[PDB]
């Protein structure tokens, strides 16, 4: 066991998925700030197979999974892995494809019905419409598996209408719309309190 790094320490039943926009709408330095936000959030969670489980995926035209929910590693090592996520700078970061991945790979089987399941979709870009044909189907699929989708729009190129589409599919799908990556550290305490509140204590 590893002791808490902060007074805020979420010890609840939660599967938390971090989906990181891999597009070039974020510079390499801005992506660094996004990764620091993910690490900051992880430091405030009790990461363990019996408490908070985390997954970290960078999405472009396709997914690169760095951490899976079932990965039995020390929190310190998971935070190190997240801090070493490589910059992609891709042209396309498809929200449809990464939500498909979340629905059909991460939550293909619900191992923990007693836990809340939350997807933090950190978006900085807009995928081409030719990739969005099944976007609503995937968001609806996640709703049916009781997966809460929380879009975090970052910067002026975030897909605002997909964010609004996500909010409409289920009332749990609250959105956070930010000016830039610099705002992540300022809203972090609010976001993690909100996510913790969504999870049960027992």
């Amino acid at each position: 066991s590893e002791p808490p790094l902060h007074d805020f320490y979420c010890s609840r039943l939660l599967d938390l998925v971090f989906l990181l926009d891999g597009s070039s709408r974020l510079s390499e330095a801005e992506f660094e700030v996004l990764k620091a936000f993910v690490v900051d959030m992880m430091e405030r969670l009790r990461i363990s197979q019996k408490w908070v489980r985390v997954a970290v995926v960078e999405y472009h035209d396709g997914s690169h999974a760095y951490i899976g929910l079932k990965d039995r590693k020390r929190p310190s090592e998971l935070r190190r892995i997240a801090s070493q996520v490589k910059y992609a700078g891709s042209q396309v970061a498809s929200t449809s494809e990464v939500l498909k991945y979340t629905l059909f790979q991460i939550f293909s089987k619900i191992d923990r019905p007693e836990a809340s399941r939350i997807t933090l979709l950190l978006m900085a870009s807009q995928e081409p419409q030719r990739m969005s044909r099944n976007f609503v189907r995937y968001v609806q699929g996640l709703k049916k598996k009781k997966v809460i989708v929380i879009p975090v729009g970052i910067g002026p190129h975030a897909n605002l209408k997909q964010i609004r589409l996500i909010e409409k599919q289920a009332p749990e799908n609250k959105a956070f719309v930010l000016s830039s990556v610099d705002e992540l550290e300022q809203q972090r305490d609010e976001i993690v309190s909100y996510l913790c509140d969504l999870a049960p204590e027992a």
Epitope: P3, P4, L5, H6, D7, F8, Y9, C10, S11, R12, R46, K50, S193, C196, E201, A202
Partner: nanobody, 128 residues
Framework: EVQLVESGGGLVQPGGSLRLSCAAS????????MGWFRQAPGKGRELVAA????????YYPDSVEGRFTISRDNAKRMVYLQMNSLRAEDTAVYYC?????????????????????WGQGTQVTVSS
């Protein structure tokens, strides 16, 4: 559950020292904000020391401030109360307690109603 077990009480002369220990266990223990209460014979329970989840903040009432020190060891899941310059009026049963109301907030807790989990108490007697 959360389980708490205290030790370290004793019989001391005025001016003496003790160091109470409280061992926490149970799967739902989350390095909760912890506190020490004391109960003089036939009276109520009073919070005499409190500490945050990390240990970076503490609280004592002015009646024991300067003389009591609360600390914790999260690797060992322990909390401690060092009691210096003991006075006759410190005679009481001392209880270790853990806050279980919105425990994700690890700040120091001063309200007794925030304390959910309790040890069995250890006796401190100060007599000349």
């Amino acid at each position: 559950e959360v389980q708490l077990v205290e030790s370290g009480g004793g019989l001391v002369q005025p001016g003496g020292s003790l160091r109470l220990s409280c061992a926490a266990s149970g799967r739902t223990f989350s390095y909760n904000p912890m506190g020490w209460f004391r109960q003089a014979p036939g009276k109520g329970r009073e919070l005499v020391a409190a500490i945050s989840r990390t240990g970076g903040s503490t609280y004592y009432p002015d009646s024991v401030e300067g003389r009591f020190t609360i600390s914790r060891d999260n690797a060992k899941r322990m909390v401690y109360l060092q009691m210096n310059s003991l006075r006759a009026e410190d005679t009481a049963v001392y209880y270790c307690a853990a806050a279980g109301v919105r425990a994700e907030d690890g700040r120091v807790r001063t309200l007794p109603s925030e304390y959910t989990f309790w040890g069995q108490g250890t006796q401190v007697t100060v007599s000349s």
